[PDB]
């Protein structure tokens, strides 16, 4: 199932060498392993939280000219 708890930004979002945006998140929930809810395009095939402790890297292709992770849901502007 989908992750039901909170995500926190572990590092400021940056542009990668291959023109995507890299989003490092840390999960706060009890339900890991779980699927990361993602809404704006997702580049990471199956963004999943393996362990609560382990931060995870998410890559996205931003459209020209807002990103939501989780469901107090993490909000990112680009």
């Amino acid at each position: 199932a989908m992750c039901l708890n909170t995500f926190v930004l572990k590092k400021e979002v940056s542009e990668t060498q291959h023109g995507t945006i890299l989003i490092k998140v840390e999960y706060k929930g009890e339900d890991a392993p779980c699927k990361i809810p993602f809404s704006t395009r997702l580049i990471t095939a199956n963004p999943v939280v393996t362990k609560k402790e382990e931060p995870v890297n998410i890559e996205a292709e931003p459209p020209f000219g807002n990103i939501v992770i989780g469901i107090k849901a993490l909000k990112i502007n680009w």
Partner: antibody
Amino acid sequence: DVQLVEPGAELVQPGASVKMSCKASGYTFSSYWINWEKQRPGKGLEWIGNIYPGSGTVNYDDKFKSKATLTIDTSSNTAYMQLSSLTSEDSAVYYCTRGGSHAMDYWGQGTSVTVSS
Amino acid sequence: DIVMTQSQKFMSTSVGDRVSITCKASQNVRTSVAWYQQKPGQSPKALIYLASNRHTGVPDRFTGSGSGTDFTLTISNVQSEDLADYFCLQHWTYPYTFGGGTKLEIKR
């Protein structure tokens, strides 16, 4: 002409640390990414990480987070890689390369690191 | 991480023949695949960018093809100078990963 200058060799003892340079010339240092690679004989090349001098962005392959430290000096157009807590597994040729949307384009001559007592 | 598989560790080819070196990605990398040539005691040289584009100065004998998961480097009219290790690299997402390489042996 794009050139990435690296020292030929480094001889270090187990448990020590080594810092190697990658001096860029023939292009604007702050406009391109620099990649760092490890190559052990008869082994698959590995990507250690990358660095963007124009912004200070550093990305590590998680496999090298406990081994490598990437830094830059825009004033001297130089990128550096430090390898610490050295073991024989770190004996390898370390390449820097210029990067971007087309991946590694120009590669340095590589620094051959020998870890031995 | 993405695994780039080059199943052929060695490929043997007669002078003047064509050789096709394969590179299989563990997931879809679109066209974000580069091919490099490495001769002994030398640094790798960039041959192909974005799966099918030849770098300036690279002979037209070298051709890159494929998308998704199946990539191929084709060398036509194989010469004594092509004796080298050829490897692929995916740069679709971090960490970038390389194929294990294919050593091209010239048959005589």
